[model samples]
Each structure stands twice: as structure tokens, then as C-alpha cells.
Target: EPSPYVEFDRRQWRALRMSTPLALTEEELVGLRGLGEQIDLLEVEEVYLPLARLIHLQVAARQRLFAATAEFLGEPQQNPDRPVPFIIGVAGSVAVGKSTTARVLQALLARWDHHPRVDLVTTDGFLYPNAELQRRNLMHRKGFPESYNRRALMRFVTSVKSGSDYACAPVYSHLHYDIIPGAEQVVRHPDILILEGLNVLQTGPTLMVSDLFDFSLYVDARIEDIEQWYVSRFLAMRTTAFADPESHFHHYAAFSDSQAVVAAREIWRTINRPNLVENILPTRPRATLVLRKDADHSINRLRLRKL
Candidate 1:
């Protein structure tokens, strides 16, 4: 049981909660579910509840630090120049439920009394639009690091962390599979901001993504499990999202089940799998916490970094 991280199994993790109430309802949980991904109340109780409590603790501690530092600087305790949202980054492989995790945490953490405003912004919006990708001949490498507008993404986070009154992030459409022109998510007066995506933990020689993050998480699972989850989610999309007339994957709806399955595997083999191996998986250790899941998509254990 000895390890670098203070490891906790599900039983030990769930026992940490005694008075913390579950703020999410069954209907809210259903809305947060990803395509072909199942997230029930029990999983939330066992996995996310503890994580939320930890985030709340950090947020509260951060507030006190700001106040203490302000006092040291001979400034007002409620100084507008000193308020910055507690930023959290969630990174993981595609179809591994990072999106669900972000949304669920947004709901759960907003329930905490000290900080009621929690907003989530995904890096999908920072991805180069389809036309731009085509211009750069990077369509096939869409999820790769080079496919994103790294500078612009950095600016968005920098503005938020610098205490800008309003910072806008571009909107991305999954059905359309492109960054929406003239659409943006405005972050205004939020207490917490959760940025969920594949490469949020990356850093450079100087300024970096993790620099602004107060806390970070990595959702981890076996590559085989992730591939299966990706394929299964694609199969469901064939009947639903792909069936939408305006959807980028609408053409896939006409493909038979076998044809769709074959296409899904090809994409995984050439695109998703490589991105996972080369980019996403390598960043797992960079996370402050890692939730390692099993074949059934249930988190079996958690790794929390020793402070």
C-alpha cells in the first residue's frame, strides 16, 4: 500500500464524508452524462464527493491567503485588485468522461456556501476551426497539440487569472465540430473556474497552462478501456448525434452498424490512440490528483499528491 501518493481505495475514500450533503439530484446527474457514459449517484458519492470536498477546502484556504496577503501589503481586505477565481484543470483521454467530471464538479462545488459561482470552460473552444485546420493541413491531427491556438488559449486563461472583470472564451460545437464564430462564454465574477480538456496540464520553458491552475486533476483508465469507451460512444452517436441533419457526423448515420464500427476503430487507431499515448497519458503525473478507473468505467482508486 506504500506509494508516492496517499492512495485511497473507494471504501476509505467514501468514509471521509460524514456531513457533506449531495447537492445534485438524479435528473441533474442524467443531464450531465456524456454519450454512452453512465454516471450514477453512487459513483458521485464515492468518487466526486470527496474530490469536491477537497476543492472546497482549497478554495477556502485560497481566500484566507488572499486576505492575509492583502493585510501584509497594507491594502483593504476586500480589495477588488486581489480577487481571482480558484482555477481547476481536469485533463484526460477522449471519451474517458472528463467532460462529465467537469460538469458534475461545476454543479457540486457551486453548492458550497462560501463560493456559489463555479464555471467550466473546455479547451475545445480553443481548437482551431475546421477551415483553419484545413488551411494548415491539420484536420487529421485535430486533437493534437499543434491543432489548437495555444497563444489565444493562454491569453484567455491569463485574463481570468489576472483578475479581469470579464474574460470571454470562444464557443465550440460538438455537433458542428467547429469553433462557432462570434460565440463566446463570458466568465464574470466566478469563484471557481474548471478548464477540462486533453492538454491543459502542458507547460513551456517560461509561462505555462499549469501556472494558473490552483488545483489539477487527471481522469485515467486503461488504453483498451478508453478505446472501447470511444468506440461504444461512437456507436451511440451514429444513432443520435450523427443522425442530426446539421451534425458534422450526420453522414455516419447512413453507414451500417458494422461500417460505423469499422470507421470508429480506424479513427481510434490513427488519431485518438496516438494522441492518448503521445500527449494525454504523459501528463498524468503532472496532475495533483488522479482518479484511476477500471473496465466498467468506475473509479476503483484515487491518488492524491502529498502536500
Candidate 2:
């Protein structure tokens, strides 16, 4: 209740929910959830609907401000107005369910009549290919900022923020564990763009990703909780996604249950754990809002920046 944020329990936060209708059904929500979650529509209604409303309101305000700017410039605002996107960044540790949050927000917010052209592009798309990472001797630092094509990432985001009619981003595949070649996704002047990743909130040697953001959200949980979730997700992947021969993790599918768990723990200790502690978690304070999760992966508390 008394920090840089105005904190609220789940109950207190849900009280902010207005009369907005459910934008998505149960099936749609299930389709949108990524690997690490079993998110329910109830969670969507209480947590994300309010968030959708807040974003909706923010986009409206920005529209008004842009219109006023156009008027001041003696430019007549017409059907094709110069309405730049309301960019949002979502950041969190691996297996912390941030992808589900991004997907949910993308679905729900797009349903709003005010903003139909919503797009969700992940920072995974910006990571260097495995061959490049190995050549640069950055394989061990895969999730670290240095492993990314930071210039391409910044340029893509800035292009969208520049109100460009079209900008493109590379595509990434978790199964490949690398950036896909000859594959690109196009962003065609979205009303809202959600860029989600572990490093989205970082302001490093290059321009801040969040500098182009109209708002940002960090999905946070205790380190122990997140590490456990990562391990669980890894084990699950060994049996499922990794089992595919085409998967980059196919080697893991051959691992026995105990071996897989051991490997997962090792990965947590060496790669992901360090990234979370040293890189990702430090950016938590930079978010405009923080959704702190419980062990069950449900958001239990919310932190809204007061300033």
C-alpha cells in the first residue's frame, strides 16, 4: 500500500472491473494460453478485462492528444488520421506465463471497437540465430541482451512508433530454438502493439524498447516460484514439444524422466536463473504496471506505478 506503487490484492483489484462484456469465450482463451498456463476465463474477466479497459482509455486519451496536436499544426484530421499505435511492452521470466498475458491482452483488446487492429509480436523474434550466437560465442548468453539483434529490434519498434503504414519483424520458433530464415511477420499500422519478452523493458546501449511504449506490464513472481515453473515446463516440453524429431529439443526427448528433471534443473541454474536474477528481474521497476503471480500462476497482486 505504501511504495512507489499503489498495491492491491486480487480482491481489491477486481473491484475496479467495470461493466465491460466478456470479449472472449472459454475456448478462445484456452487457444491463446501458451505452454506454462491453465488460465481461465474468470482470470481474464477479472485481471485482463480491467487491463483492457485501462488500455482502451489510454488509447482514447492519446487519440485526443494527437488530434489536438494536428489541430495546433493547422492540419485537418480526416478519415486517414495520423494515429500512431499505442505500443505496450510485456516482460517476465521464462515460464512465468507472460506469453499468456500478452496473448490474452491481444485478444481482448482487439475486441474493443475502438482498437480492432491489435498485433502481438514477441522479442523472441529478435534473438540472433543459433549459428550466429555460436559464432559470436554468445550461445551461453542466449537470453541476454547481447545475444539479440538489438538494432533490428529497435528499428522495428521505432518504425511502428514512427506511424509507418507497414513494418516487418522476423519470426522465431521455439521448436527450432532459433530465428527462422526467410520468415517475416508484418505489422500493418496496428492500433495496439504488444511486444512481450524477457528484455523488453531494458534501456541499454541502444534506445529503450519501452521508450516507444505507451504502457508496459511486467508479470512477476518469486524467484523460487519462477524457477520451479521453468523446471516443470521444461519437463513437460521433453515429453511433448521436444519429442518431435524436428524440434531443437529432440535430444531431450531421449532423456529419461529423472534425467530430464536433472537437465532442467541444470538449465535453470546455469542459463535461465542467472538471466532472471541478473538481467530480467532488474527491469521490474520500470514497468507501468506489475502483475505479481502466485505459485499457481494466477495473478494475486497488482502494482500500479503511482508516478
Candidate 3:
């Protein structure tokens, strides 16, 4: 069959080896979280391994660029050049399992030598604390682009890339549905950082979050599938997690299944779907890669923009 996008012939995989690992070893992908489902071997081999190799090549290329720039600037001794980590942004509609994709990538990419210091940061941390949203009467718009503390998020990325030590990322707790007070992830030094969010790729006349990334990715699925997943997860929460007295979602815990489903659908229509359409979808073309998912929640195709 004539190929659509195989720019490199089969034998050329070896020709590109020196820039990154010659081959990736099929390792035991060991589950990262207790509830994490084991991903199939086929997905690891065909889907993620190639992407990891690309990221590895990017890191090596960045290192070479910095070294050349240092020589040209003539301050090699003074330039204690820490490798500037590549920032990867992953965006997807709510309940499309973007979180799962981000976590899995963090685990897999950690095996890449050039990316051993990988850190995964979810932009959920940048979401406005509940009090702030309440104050502004914007509680219903929680996951929208306007809800994030845009300035603080940018400052965190800037410090990391500039090689600052002890950078603290703000924390958000799902239980409280708000930014956790005094909780932060202290990033030391890392070779790679993956930033995941509902609208991570959005760009506009606004200047903060869009400028921080070195690479970007989008995890996409059909709207119907996303709505189904969102409703199912909400039902699970209403049944289980919401029963805890300290749970912020406890108010809806005692609702009947039918009632909970309606509420979930309403929220999806009013908040999530609109946010995806108005903000996230427009930025799809800006991503370096797009992972298109099937209804069964596995990647069907990967689209990468030409370099």
C-alpha cells in the first residue's frame, strides 16, 4: 500500500538512532497508581515509544543549541548551563481521561535517559481557589480559562526554565474542589515537565500561560464519548467519594442516581462543553501533537505538525 505519512522508510529508523536511543527496551511498565489500569503492550510499543523517542531527540537538540550559543557568547566557564527542561502541554475535554494519559506519559518518559528528571504538573493547581470564585460570582465557570491564576502559573514555569531551585507549584485538592492552602510541589531540577489541563493550549491577546511551553499535545475524543465519561464519573463520585463528611461534593451525595446524572449533564452542557468549544478546540492547531482517541478510550491516530 502507498503510505500517507511515512516520510522515513523502514530502514531509516536505524539511521535516526544516534540522535536518541538506538532502540527502546520493552520494560515492565509497572502500574504507577493503585487504580491505574495496565495499558496494553501494543500501546506502549506503537503509540508511546515513538513519542518518547521524539522527546528524547528534542532534549538532545536543545542541549546542542545551548552549547553552541555558549561558545558563540564566549562565557563557557561562567555559564553553568543546567539543561532547560522541555515543557509539554497536554489538553483535552473534561472526562476524556487526559489525566490518565498525562500520568502514563510521565511514567514512560521517565525511562528515557535524557528525561529522567521528568516532572508532571497539572494546571488544576492554577485554578482559582473556591473562595475567589465565590467572591467573583464565577463558581459555575470554574474550569474555564478565566478561572486560573494565570500570572502565578507563568512565573512558576519561568523559574524552572531559568534553572531556579526549589520552585513550588501550588496545590489543588479534588476533595476540597479548591486550591489547597500551603500545599505545594517543590520542583528541584528536571529534564522534562508535562503540564496537563483542560485548556492548556489556549492562546490569545492575553499573555501568560501560552508562552511557557516548549512542546504541546492534545488528547481528543468525540463530544458524545466525553459526555458519557463525565456522567459515569459523576455517578461514581455520588456513590462513593461524596459520602465522606469532609468531601466538598457531599451535598450531592444523597441524590438519586437519575438526579445526579441530570446534574452531571447540565454541568457538562453549561460549563465543560462550552469551555472546550470556545477555548480548547481553537488551540488544537497550535499543538505539536494531537492524540485522537476512539470511543473505547484508546488513541486511534496521532497528528503531528510538520517541523
Candidate 4:
């Protein structure tokens, strides 16, 4: 069968920006950078600016369609003035930089006057707590599709898509490697919602979390590169977050540089790599767009699904 995607090289993709101003400053971009990832102002201008504009246009089109459908039905609209949010899903492996991509999109999208309120929620919030995972004997399989509370995640996305005035999700803490009890991230009718996760694109046997998405992106990189990034991130965290006594991986802080590298490689081999191969990668074809990254962590090309 013929491919349904239109691919663009870096230069070709950059030209798509088409007068979309760079609203993000250097400091803002630096703050958005993820561990072991490199992104700069030029990247924002060339890559994400065009993406933000595309999503902005799609949101406007969706809004108009909703209004037209209501008029065609000749039915009274509920909260006619309230804007329905455009839901976007960002999915990739653990070290693929999807979080940074989502954050950049959020910042840029919010700058547009039409959609000033943008909210970002990660699927980490929907993962089972550490205690629950331990009870279920799934501690070794964390980040896999089975590790998440799919029902709660589905309900949250459905409520937001249905235009609920208030929707809340549990808050996850990377430092603690678990969900924070009694803590919540409440979303109040955002104009755009960016849902970032490792398996957000996976389809359930009966339903899918991605079914509610207006657009979705998959960050693509070679497995070897991802494993390298994961190991590097682990080493960096050894002296930083993992050094905290309260951190789940605090014991690693005592390890020497070589020991840390050994442990990181073992964890990647047993955990992250398997999840990426068995679950995350299979869903890439389902994304509306794919950002293929170079070994240096810059996006080298884009593959957009043909409408």
C-alpha cells in the first residue's frame, strides 16, 4: 500500500513557519529543556513555530465545525460562549524528549490570542502508585501500558472533551517516582490540552485514550540513541534528584560513576527498552505527525499524515 504521509526535511519543514513570530525568549527555551536534551531558539523558530500555527488553525476549524453542527440541529447550545478545548497527544519513549516538545507547544500555543489558556497533563499522573504497583507485582513493568489506570485516564479525557467546566487529574512527582497523594492538577476549560505520555497512543481492546485527541505527535529516534539518552539522564540524576533522601532511587547516589553506569544500563535493558519495543513503538503509526530526531537531539525531519 502507498504511504499516507508527506515527509519534509529540516529546511523544507522550517520554511513552513510562514511568518509565525518567535514569541519564546532564550531563557524560556532553556527552562523548557529536558535532561540530556538540547533545544534552542532556532529550533523553536524553525520547528515548533510552524507546528503551533498548524494546531492553531486546526483548533479554529474545529470550533467553527462545532458551531455549524449546532446551528444545523437548530438546538439550543449549552454554554455557547465557552470554547471547547483542542486535545493533543504527545507520545514517545522515556528519553525521547516528548515532555519538552509538549511544553514548547504549550508555551507557543498559549501566546496566540485566540487560545490564551493552554494546559498540559502527563499520563504519569494516571500510573498506578508505587505501593499499588508493588502489590500488583508490576514494579518491574512500570511505564508499560498495563501500569496505568486506564479507566481513570479515559474518564478524565472524556470529561474534558465533553466540555466539562472542571476536570482534575492526580499529580505525579518525578523526584519521588510516584503519585503525590491528595495533590491534583485541576483543569478549568482550557482552550488547548496537551496530554503527554509513553503509551498515550495505545488503543484499548474496546476503546482508546487517543480517540478523543484532535491531534497527536510521536517523537521518533533510534533505539540505540534512546538507550544512550536514558543512561545519560540516569547518571545526571545520580547527583541531583536521586541524591535526595526521599527519592525512590536515592540509594544510587552512593554509587561511583562506573557503578552508576552499570546500574543504568541494567535498568534500561530490563525495563525501558522492553516497554518501548513492546508497547510504545507499535503505536507510532497512529500519530497524526512524527518528529524524527537526530542523534544530537535535534529534530531532523517531519512526517505529517496526509489529510
Candidate 5:
């Protein structure tokens, strides 16, 4: 059988932008770009603009389908008044720039007239507290599927999908490297929700988180390139966030560049690489769209699943 995906090179994909105006300025793009990511306005215009438009089209189609289904069942219309927000899941390996992809989509998608309210949430908040992870002996497997509070994550997404007027999720502190007690992030009826994570597409015995997603994306890159980016980001943070006394990685802040590189490589080889190979990359096929990046952190090609 032929492949289910229609692949597009950068040039071809760029043409798909059609007439979508570039709504982001240089300042906004700078704020949106992740550390070590190189996303310019042209990149947004070429790569993400078309993606936002396609997602908008898909959302509209789903709305129409919902209306038709309600009519067919002779039920009262539940849309517009009680709108169920369109949920998007973004999944990828650590340091593959999935967060940047999600943020860019959230910004671009919200600019559309139809869905002016877009909310972005990260699954990091669903991760178990450090104490729980230590008790479970999952500290070394931080980004693995087992490290997260899977039940709580599922319940939160379920509530939102059910069109709940208010949904709340726990807050995580990257500096503290744990869940913050009594802190929460609230979602209030956004027109669109973007859930970004390392393992959002992971399947459980009976159900998967992606089941709640109206659309899903996977950011992809070669393992070696991702490892390089991971190390680079680690070094960058050593001088910035890691230098803070309260930062979980503050001990490494004083490491020489060579020592930092060695430590980062060890962590990557032991923890991140295994998780990526065993858990994250396997979920790529489940995504509706895949954005493959070049070593320089530029999206070079796209694989869009055929309807």
C-alpha cells in the first residue's frame, strides 16, 4: 500500500501559505522562539502560517460536522452557546523544539477571526512532584511516561473536552524542579487549546491522551542533532537560569564548559536518549502532522496525514 502521508518539501509547503498575512512582528517572533531555535518572521510565514490556516479549516469542518450530527439526532444545538474548544496535542522528544512549535501555533491560530481565544498548556505541570518521583524511583526518568500524574492529566483534559466552563491544572516550577503546592493554572473556555508535551500521544491500556485531541502534531529531528541542541541548551542555561541559587541545577552553574558538556552528554545518553527511542519517537506516526527539522533548527519538511 502507498504511504498515508503526503510529504512536502519546504518550498512546496511554503507555497501553501496562500494569502495568510504574517501577523507576527520581529519582537513577537523573538519572544516565541525557544532557546537555540532559529525562527524568523520568514520561517513563520513559510512554515507555520499554512499550518495555522489548515488547522483553522479543520476546526471549521469539525464544527459543521457537530452541527450536522446534532440535527441528525434531533437534539438541541449545543454549539456556539456551549462550545467545546478544539484541542490540539503537540508531542516530540525533549529538545526537538515542540514547545516552540506549540507556542507559534497558539499565536498564529489565535490571530484568526474565528477563534480569537487560544490557550497553550504544557504537560510538565502534570508531572509528579519530586518526592513522588523519588518514591517511585522515577527521578532519572523524568520525562518518561511513568513520571507524570497520568490520571490527573487525563481528568483535566477530559473536563475541558466535556466543555467545562472552568478547568484547572497544577503548576510546575522548572527552577524548583517540582510541582508547586497550591498553585494552579486555570483555563476558561478558550476557543482553542494547545497541549504540548513529550508524551501526549502515549497510549494507555484502554485510552490515550491523543483521543481528546481534535488535531495533533509531532516535531521531529535526528537523534544526533537533538542531542547537540540539548547540550547547547544546557550550556546556555548554566549561565542563565541555572546560576540562580534556587535553580535545581544551580550546582552545575559553576562547571566549566567542558565539564558541562560532559555532564550533559552523560544525562542525554542515560536518560533522554533512551526515553526518546523507546517512548517518544514511537508516537510520531500517531500525529496528524509531523514537522521535521534540520540540524540548524529550521523546519525543512512536513508530513501531513491524508484524510
Candidate 6:
């Protein structure tokens, strides 16, 4: 079956509707600014709200299907899944502006009355701490699939699917660049959950962390554009975030513009891009949606699943 909203368009295409549409609270949308001015509260309203509502509709419909299956077997559903979470996966290349995308989507989805509780679980939270990676000699492969604790991810998702009263996920800190041990983000059986990462689309005969995703998305752009963006962002960060003395990357504050650019490029080529092409891009076909970006990093096209 062809998906109704899966086709790509250059301009801001018409907003498609689902059986239901949920709105986001103002406070929720405000935190989407960590990336840049390119994506803001307005973008969440204009771009993500409609998409989020569609996701809500899908989750509701899936619940109905589950009920039917239970009925067919003449079994009573004691603990019926009342508010099943709408699980969404977002994947993309380095410096392609995926963080902004995830934040906007999360803020927009939470506004709705159907989803009083919306959880945004970043795969970053599941990354093995740097010490663990170094111990295994997989330090450079930090963003690679092999670096993640796949068993833990699977367990987390299963608990959510099982409709447990409360589900807790690990918390990660960017400034420290490590998983905050004992810090857990609680999702109290939310009506929606957005999982964002560089490799959220992977699904295969050999199961991995991201294989538990229900719906996946790939944020894509030209490699050159992304590289340029990465360099620009690294330079920008060196002046801003790297100023914090306690930051894990504080040393980058003293880096010259040229030094930062070269380093960013090398890291992208050796670590991020390789993961994208090998582990991430291959799973693009499995995505329920694909968001394509332009040289400017603005989302110009969206390819939705047509099933």
C-alpha cells in the first residue's frame, strides 16, 4: 500500500492530518534552541505538530488491533494497554541538525491532551561511558552500534511495551561526555516516546539496540554540506561550550579555527560518517519517514511510509 504522506516535496508541503492531533505546551517547545535559530518554536508548530498527531493516530490504531487479537482468542485483557506510547525513531549524520529535530518533535507531541506524558529518550543516554569504551579499545567507535549496550536498550523498550507503571532510562551528560551513573529519566507509561540517534533505523537478523524502534526516521543531507556544518558548529562550540572549565571538551576552547575545522573533519570521516554509511544509511529503507535537508540544513523534503 502506498503511504499518503510519503512523497517528497521541496517546498513546505501541506500539513497532513491524522485521526487525532495533539498540541505542545509553550514551555516544552522553548527548549528546542540548543541547535540554532534555523529551527525554533515556530518550526515545531508549522512542521512537527501535524506529524506528531499522525503518530498519535497510528498508536491508537495499533491498540485497536491488539484488542481485536485478544478478542479473537476469547481472552480477557485484564490490564489493557490504555495509553500506549507512540514510539518514534530519528536518525541522521553528524552535524546534520538532528538534535533540533528531536527537540521540536518532542515539544510538539507533548502539548496534546492525548499524551499528557511524552518521553524523549536520546540514544546518547545509552552510550557506554568513555572509560568502558577505552577499556574495550572501542573508544573511537563511540557512536557506532557496537559501542552501545544493546541488551539494556532492548530491555528498556520491552518494559515500555509491557506497559509498566514506570519505566526508567539512563541519563547522559554532554558536558561530561559520559552516562551519568545512577541518573535515570523516568517515563511513566507515556503516551508518546521519541528515540533520536545517529543509528536509530538499524534492524536486522542480528538484533541491536535500535532494532526495538517502532517507527524510524533518517535526517539526510549532502555529505559536503554536513561536513561544512560540522566544522562551523565545532568552531562555534569552541567559543561557547568549550569555555566551561569543567566541560569534558574544555581543551577545545584554545583550538585555532583551522585546528578545529581539521579535527572536526577527521572525526567525521573516521568515526561519524563511517557509522552513517555503514550502519545508519543502510537502514534508511526501513524508516517510516525520511526527512531530507538542503545545503542550508533546512528540512525541505519528507518521505513518509506508504503502507
| Candidate closest to the true structure, highest TM-score | 5
Overall lDDT per candidate, in order of appearance: 0.87, 0.87, 0.74, 0.90, 0.90, 0.74
For residues 1-307, could you state the per-residue lDDT of candidate 5 as single tens digits? 6888899999999899888988888999889988889888988989998998898888889788777887899988885755768899999989899999999999898888654678899999999999999999999999999999888998888888777888999999989989999999999878888999999988878566788889999999999999999999999998788989999889999999999999999999999999999999999998999999999998989999985
| Candidate 2 C-alpha lDDT tens digits along 174-234 | 8888888999999998878999999999887656777888899999999998988888888
Instruction: Please provide the root mean square deviation of candidate 2 (C-alpha atoms, Å).
Output: 1.8
Candidate 4 has a TM-score of 0.96
Model 4, range 1-307, lDDT digits (tens) per residue? 6888899988998898998988888998889988787998999988898898888778878888778888899966646467777899999999999999999999998888654789999999999999999999999999998899989999999899888988999989988899999999999888788999999998876677798888999999999999889888888998888989999889998988899889999999999999999999999998999999999998989999986
lDDT of 1 by residue, 190-303 (tens): 777899999898877768777889999999999999989988888888778998999988999898879978999999999999999999888888798999888988898888
In angstroms, how far off is 215's CA in candidate 2? 0.6
Pairs that collide, model 4: none
Pull out the clashing pairs in model 3.
none
TM-score of each: 0.94, 0.95, 0.85, 0.96, 0.97, 0.88
Best to worst by lDDT, what's the order? 5, 4, 1, 2, 3, 6
Better of 2 and 6 by TM-score: 2
Write down the TM-score for model 3.
Answer: 0.85
User: Which residue pairs show backbone clashes in model 1?
Assistant: none
Clashes of 4: 0
For residues 109-187, what per-residue lDDT tens digits would candidate 3 score against the true structure? 7866543788999888988888899997789988888898877888887788767865888999988888888999988
Where does candidate 2 stray beyond 4 Å? 1-3, 67-82
Which ranges of candidate 4 are over 4 A from the true structure? 77-80
